[PDB]
């Protein structure tokens, strides 16, 4: 019951009473596992931007990171370092776009990589977690470029440098599957399968048309690099799952995260970051609530819990907050973290009862974005 | 009256007794078969038209007439931009103004005079009958009077709904009758959010009662020299249309190289495309905007020449602002596009599109 | 204030969040910092792209074609901050798509969010 | 009593029903006038901020202003032009600092100088109005440089260049009094007449000492260059008044804001910009409330009105909001601004009755600053 | 929560605006950002410059000097914002100023504000 | 016993027969009167001291022996960062280790070796009965013994209150039995606020019990060599000064130049400053951290000379991070600092305050 602050207090008094020395300096952030929580703050598209690093299980903000107008945030599952793509103008939000990559140590936070990428090329939108991606190995990061036309951009980390603009089809969303490989998704409705190698134009592969054109899919779903899981919910709950761990596109039994009876009920999917999967567990996370089909951005109050490979409902939890976005820590006994945007709070659940056990509050100005590194 | 004029500018308008040699009418190169423009094969193919002698071509593309009538007189509204007029540069002040000018043009229809109209007028029975009584008694004794009454009736032809019938697919789409094909909605969908809608729509903002696809601005595209149709005119490789600058009281140099936004209905069986008429395809018209655009190789090469689209004729004066728009076309979106305009196509002109 | 609840157009408050010409804004309404409904703050720039929606008129019963315009190189204004999603599609379909910065063709490239105008383009359909 | 907002949905509505057409463009602000009124939003110490420029009689937004790191605003009292002195850094609070200040048009408000300050050197300190300041010819700005030593930069607005950095003794605050003239408060207790050319040491003269070591004179003291009056409260509400019209110092009578059974109650002034005075009323404002002694910078509730000549109290209102900062528009008829850093909101009052007429809300994350211009 | 009401001093939570070495604090409590009582988050700069305050501590009836340091580098955390003013006095006195980025000597020459530690210097006098 | 030793020191301490040609005791370089520094003038002024032989200069300043009781044995700690020790460049551990060094010291008091001075000691019936009372019969006998005996008697003197009395009027003020000037109050508040705290004060933070205004760290401040002081001591033009780097077992390159904080007690009436006495007045020593931060000509200017501070004897592994602080200090802050300093002064004497 004794809170953070006030074991701080009783430590200090103990401290000046024993007369014990201590020197000012500069903390270094906790090494990073399993229940460290990053959660961005796009902050409504303001021309600055905040990243929370959150200790998940102390529910303590035990770093910060600052960017620029809507970056992307990435984080390395074996937890060696953290990144963004971030764009800085010379007068505020006015002159020179500058855009740019930076690497940083995970518990200094000093960035170790200042990368700058050329021509501003990044597209720049409400955050989505897999508009820019690393390759497996971490060596390479992947942004996409709307404008012109759509394209990726190939970062190398190791040597610090921008390398190429990739062309692609009419094509969205990067998820990364080899040190030389990547899909997308299409309009067309297909995924390409995008293979570059150290030179020339990238072989494009096309699997076949996978959901029809009234077929909604949502821009923020759920993939786990490590597991080659591609767990994609459209607006009314169904949800495509897609093997990608043989290198090619494998399309797993078609689920339905919410019951016919509760579709005809107004039972829809809504928020941001609406799914999570947790890897070990093979179970995806849904944020659902009672809604008109056209308020699919709006907050809910409920997460039901599905196994990915039969599809049935392992439970469903009330969340008792207004939540935006999800995601899972990846170890055993997970968390489930529940952010509101509203309220600017991270709510800490037990992912196996649903129960909230801690919250961190104060978390900028609009936190819409939840990133957990798959440590194990 | 007003029935009477038109049914005077009907008989007037397919009458090749208004030309020279009597070898050509308005109808000669405003073909009704093909939505009033020149389906002649010429020295430089369908981009520019042979007059009556028999030799001489022009410098521009044959619009069409269908919707002209829908054009405001020549203007300079309160955002220093002008607006409306005829011909590709403006140079005529509305449809009356515009129609004897073929007939005295000596690369046209070739009369020398208005007098020698008139003498052709005064040998035709019926026009004596028609023009008499709508003007009154002697009207074709008197050169000037004829002439411009025989402007006034082709201009009043030219108002009548048969050259503006709004019953293409997209006014039926807009009176609720039917619906676009996916194909067609997005079509249109890119066409009103992308850079077209800021020059190929009536209004700003609003909707327009009666759309033709056009602002009535003049603006400078960039478009190269069509070689074979310069060289076809016989105006010579020194020559250089600066567009509306050529409309006589027009001084400002910022002019220089601009032309009439044309309406983009029957766009689709009016071709070969720009006032040079220098792309034969339609999807070439398209593509050719893509050019401010996209930073691909191919969008710098003509797809009907395979090399690049060539130095604009004037390099000053472009819409940069709004053709830099900071998207390309892909191929879906330009499918659509051509799929939309073709929705533009008048319902009598619909066997045309195969 | 039911934000799951079907949204309710009105025509009577252009500053409001269910005017019915914002059914598909996202952002802050350009009235609220010096614009007008269709028109940009001074200092800011007017891009030339645009998102898409149909939006539903209860005054007149039709349903009209909303083309949003951002006004660009200022930071977020911050006032009568909106989002709505009538008939707003997936990334992967651009022009309905209302999470896009589309400040494209903007001049002196300016790409940073201030607010959205809401002009009538045409009929729906 | 129809708002602005219902007036708009009208006016559109009776366009679309004309038919009625109109460019969609970039508006101008209406001419700047006596009852403009500009709210700065210093962000409690944000990397960016933002400057409101409000119609006070419409009380509406008819522009705004973009700023780095607690930018100092100034504005031409004959309307020509604003302007501003700001900070940024080349990665969002990191990085290579630029010093700088510009110039805006008032209508466009579009940036008419960009003026780099070499070596950083602005005073970067929670908004004070008179730590820069523009000359009575409005062709020169100066600010304060705390850092190494108290000094002042001479910015030549006419010719678009920094001109020079002034070693001053250790003293405070500028407040021009001519084109080569400002004075200074000093930790003595005195004033300093600061007179300066482009080169040489400038000659530098000590007032009288005017207060006692502790007498705390308020951060925010009121300045009318057109009156050359300097209107300045001690933490009592004891208003100390200085006439610099001749162009030198001349100690006026002091005033007591409240009476002694109100200072033995627990009366004080209490806020941010806690004094106003109008020109051309010789009328003197001042944010007062019961509270702690050192509670000197909270809100407070009701502003005292005092003839500026006999100390004669004229009014006591009673604001009816957490009020932080006043001003006065400084025409006939005064508008009482009365601005909540908590509400984030200008309430605007009538000055003669105290009576709150209208309200502009959402004005930033932590507004502090109301300037206006003295055109009359 | 009577924000005029006289200052009170408590020794038992360090992130409340209320604890007693905070009396005069101005901005926010890097404990609230990965900092502790005395120490500055990760990836910020400590300040070498400092404000003071004598600051009574309700545990053991003495006054102490708390020399206030700043941590810069980072935009303002936005957590546990806290203003105290106990015997703060006005610029021209900037040894107990608040007002002031006290950010000097900080290392990159860092100058933004972040957040503020509260450690003991001395005992009042 | 504690008594009795002490009481021993008191005796050796003043006793000149602990020097080659008997004209010098340690009370001679360490006077009573001056807090316990040298009066006497060298070739050097006051920079130097002068030995036994009347001829030989040191190279380094006669520092007060007030307080240094008070400095804890030679250690590195945690941080990296050493402490405590003896002697500038703390060659010595603690004082003990101290006590004998002068004795041997040829530029000194140039005893040959241990065995002439456990036979001066043996010399005197009072030595002998001293001596044998605390550490037994045959003490003086054994030369190792009666030396380290020696130096044991003299560290336990410098441990007593007549060298740490607290009783400055800092002291007087922190007990609550009177105030501080203005002036002062001013001072002591500058020099907590400033980069001075930084290395003159015991702790990081918290309350220090017994407070002299010391860290016991090693700082290179970035001094210049005093010409007149270094031509007296002969070590030849081509000499440095390594300070820290000098003491026996410390081999890495970044201490060199470092050398221990002084305590600032007394400072007002131990003149002259730093480890070489290069500065005369203390108003010079305290101008000297302006260099660092002042962009104003005057700041690398000193005004004793009227010329620049001077190159540093070593320009490597200076404490910039704490020497640039960003802020100068202006007349009014240095005349405060003066006046806060003087506050540090030991009551016996505030007399000696007025020259
Ligand atoms: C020799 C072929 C030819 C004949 C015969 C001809 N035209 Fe044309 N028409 C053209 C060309 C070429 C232009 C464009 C010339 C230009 O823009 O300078 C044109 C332009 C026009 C325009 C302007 C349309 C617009 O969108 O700007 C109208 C109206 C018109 N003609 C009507 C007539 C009438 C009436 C007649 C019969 C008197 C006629 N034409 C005879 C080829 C012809
Ligand atoms: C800057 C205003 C402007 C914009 C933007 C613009 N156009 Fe045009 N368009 C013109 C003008 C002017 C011409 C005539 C050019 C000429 O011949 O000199 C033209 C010609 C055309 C033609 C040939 C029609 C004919 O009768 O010859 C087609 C087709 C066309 N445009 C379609 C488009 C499409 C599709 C887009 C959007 C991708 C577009 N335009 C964007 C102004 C514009
Ligand atoms: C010739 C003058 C002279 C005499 C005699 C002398 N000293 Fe010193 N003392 C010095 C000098 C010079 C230093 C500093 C030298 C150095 O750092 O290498 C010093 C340093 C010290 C220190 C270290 C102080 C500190 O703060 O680091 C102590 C303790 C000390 N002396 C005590 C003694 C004792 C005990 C005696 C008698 C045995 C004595 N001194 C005799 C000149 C003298
Ligand atoms: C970087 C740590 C550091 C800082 C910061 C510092 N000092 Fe020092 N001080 C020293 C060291 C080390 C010496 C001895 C230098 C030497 O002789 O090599 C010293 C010597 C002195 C002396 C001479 C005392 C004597 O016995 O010779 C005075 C006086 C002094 N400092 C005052 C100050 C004042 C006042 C400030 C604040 C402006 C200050 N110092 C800042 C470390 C520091
Ligand atoms: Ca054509
Ligand atoms: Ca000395
Ligand atoms: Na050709
Ligand atoms: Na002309
Ligand atoms: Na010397
Ligand atoms: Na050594």
């Given at each position: ?7 701080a207090?009783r ?25 460290r929580?990053?959660?961005?703050d796009?902050?409504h ?10 200790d ?12 620029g ?7 390395a ?12 103008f010379?007068?505020?939000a006015?002159?020179e ?18 990368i ?15 508009m820019?991606?690393?390759?497996p ?8 470029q709307?404008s012109?036309?759509?394209?990726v951009?190939?970062?190398d ?7 190429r ?15 030389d ?7 067309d409705?297909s ?8 030179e ?25 690099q ?11 709950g169904?949800?495509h799952?897609?093997?990608?761990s ?15 009876a ?5 039972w ?9 999967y947790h890897?070990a ?16 951005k ?7 819990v599905?196994?990915?490979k ?8 009330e ?7 999800i995601?899972?820590?990846?170890d055993?006994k ?20 649903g ?8 978390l ?13 | 009256?007003?029935?009477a004029?038109?049914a ?14 009597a070898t050509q ?5 405003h ?9 002649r ?8 038209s042979?007059?009556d ?8 593309n ?9 054009v ?29 000018q ?17 003498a ?7 026009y004596?009958?028609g ?10 004794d008197?050169?000037?009077?004829a002439?411009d ?16 019938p ?12 039917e ?21 190929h ?5 609003g909707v ?6 056009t602002?009535?601005?003049?603006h ?18 020194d ?8 409309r ?12 009439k ?8 069986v ?8 220098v ?9 050719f ?7 691909r190789?191919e969008?710098?090469?003509?797809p ?6 060539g ?6 004066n ?30 009598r002109?619909?066997?045309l599109?195969? | 204030?039911?934000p ?19 059914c ?6 350009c ?15 007017l ?5 898409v ?10 349903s ?8 660009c190189?200022?930071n ?13 599609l997936?990334?992967?379909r651009?022009?309905f ?7 494209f063709?903007?001049?002196?490239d300016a ?7 809401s002009?009538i ?5």
């Amino acid at each position: 019951q004794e809170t953070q602050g006030q074991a701080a207090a009783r430590a200090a008094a103990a401290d000046l009473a024993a007369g014990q020395d201590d020197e000012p300096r500069i903390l270094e952030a906790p090494a990073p596992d399993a229940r460290r929580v990053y959660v961005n703050d796009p902050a409504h598209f303001a021309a600055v931007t905040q990243q929370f690093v959150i200790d998940g299980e102390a529910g303590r903000v035990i770093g910060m990171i600052d960017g620029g107008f809507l970056p992307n945030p990435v984080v390395a599952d074996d937890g060696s370092f953290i990144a963004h793509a971030s764009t800085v103008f010379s007068r505020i939000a006015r002159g020179e776009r500058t855009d740019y990559v930076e690497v940083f140590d995970p518990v200094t936070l000093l960035p170790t990589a200042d990368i700058e990428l050329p021509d501003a090329p990044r597209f720049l939108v409400g955050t989505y977690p897999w508009m820019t991606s690393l390759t497996p190995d971490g060596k390479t990061l992947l942004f996409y470029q709307f404008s012109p036309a759509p394209a990726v951009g190939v970062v190398d980390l190791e040597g610090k440098a921008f390398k190429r603009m990739l062309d692609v089809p009419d094509c969205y969303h990067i998820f990364p599957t080899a040190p030389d490989t990547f899909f997308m998704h299409c309009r067309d409705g297909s995924l390409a399968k995008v293979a570059f190698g150290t030179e020339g134009t990238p072989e494009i592969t096309h699997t076949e048309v996978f959901h029809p054109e009234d077929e909604f899919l949502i821009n923020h779903p759920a993939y786990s690099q490590k597991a080659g899981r591609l767990v994609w919910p459209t607006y009314t709950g169904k949800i495509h799952q897609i093997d990608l761990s043989s290198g090619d596109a494998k399309f797993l039994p078609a689920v339905e995260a919410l019951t016919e009876a509760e579709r005809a009920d107004g039972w829809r999917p809504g928020g941001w970051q609406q799914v999570a999967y947790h890897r070990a567990l093979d179970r995806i996370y849904l944020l659902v609530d009672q809604r008109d089909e056209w308020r699919h951005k709006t907050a809910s109050r409920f997460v039901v819990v599905l196994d990915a490979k039969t599809g049935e409902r392992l439970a469903k939890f009330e969340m008792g907050h207004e939540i935006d976005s999800i995601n899972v820590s990846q170890d055993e006994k997970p968390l489930l973290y529940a952010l509101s945007t509203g309220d600017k709070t991270l709510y800490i659940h037990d992912a196996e009862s649903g129960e909230e056990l801690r919250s961190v509050n104060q978390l900028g100005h609009g936190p819409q974005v939840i990133t957990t590194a798959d440590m194990g | 009256a007003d029935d009477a004029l038109a049914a005077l500018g009907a008989q007037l308008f397919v009458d090749p007794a208004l030309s020279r040699n009597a070898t050509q009418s308005c109808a000669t190169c405003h073909d009704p078969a093909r939505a009033f423009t020149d389906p002649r094969e010429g020295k430089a193919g369908l981009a520019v038209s042979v007059g009556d002698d028999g030799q001489s071509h022009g410098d521009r593309n044959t619009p069409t007439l269908g919707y002209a009538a829908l054009v405001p007189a020549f203007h300079r509204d309160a955002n220093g931009k002008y607006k409306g007029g005829q011909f590709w540069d403006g140079r005529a002040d509305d449809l009356k103004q515009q129609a004897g000018q073929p007939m005295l043009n000596p690369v046209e229809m070739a009369m020398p005079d208005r007098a020698a109209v008139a003498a052709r007028l005064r040998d035709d029975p019926a026009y004596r009958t028609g023009f008499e009584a709508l003007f009154g008694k002697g009207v074709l004794d008197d050169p000037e009077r004829a002439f411009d009454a025989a402007a006034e009736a082709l201009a009043a032809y030219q108002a009548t709904g048969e050259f503006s019938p709004f019953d293409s697919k997209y006014d039926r789409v807009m009176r609720g009758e039917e619906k676009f094909t996916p194909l067609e909605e997005f079509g249109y969908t890119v066409f009103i959010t992308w850079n077209c809608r800021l020059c190929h729509m009536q209004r700003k903002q609003g909707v327009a009662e009666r759309e033709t696809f056009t602002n009535f601005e003049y603006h400078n595209i960039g478009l190269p020299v069509n070689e074979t149709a310069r060289e076809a005119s016989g105006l010579g490789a020194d020559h250089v249309d600066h567009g509306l600058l050529a409309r006589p009281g027009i001084e400002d140099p910022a002019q220089s190289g601009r032309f009439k936004v044309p309406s983009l209905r029957n766009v689709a069986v009016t071709g070969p495309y720009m006032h040079n008429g220098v792309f034969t395809d339609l999807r070439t018209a398209i593509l050719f905007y893509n050019k401010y655009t996209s930073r691909r190789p191919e969008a710098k090469i003509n797809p009907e020449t395979g090399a690049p689209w060539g130095e604009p004729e004037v390099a000053r004066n472009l819409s940069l602002a709004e053709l830099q728009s900071g998207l390309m076309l892909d191929d879906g979106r330009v499918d659509a596009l051509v799929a939309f305009l073709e929705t533009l196509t008048d319902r009598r002109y619909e066997p045309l599109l195969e | 204030t039911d934000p799951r609840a079907k949204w309710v157009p009105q025509d009577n408050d252009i500053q409001a969040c269910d005017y019915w010409r914002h059914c598909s804004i996202d952002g802050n309404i350009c009235d609220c910092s010096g614009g007008s409904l269709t028109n940009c703050p001074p200092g800011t720039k007017l891009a030339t792209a645009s998102w898409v929606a149909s939006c539903y008129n209860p005054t007149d019963g039709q349903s009209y074609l909303i083309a949003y315009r951002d006004c660009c190189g200022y930071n977020v204004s911050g006032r009568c901050p909106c989002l709505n999603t009538e008939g707003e599609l997936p990334v992967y379909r651009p022009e309905f798509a209302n999470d896009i910065i589309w400040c494209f063709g903007a001049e002196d490239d300016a790409m940073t969010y201030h607010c959205t105008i809401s002009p009538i383009v045409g009929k729906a359909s």
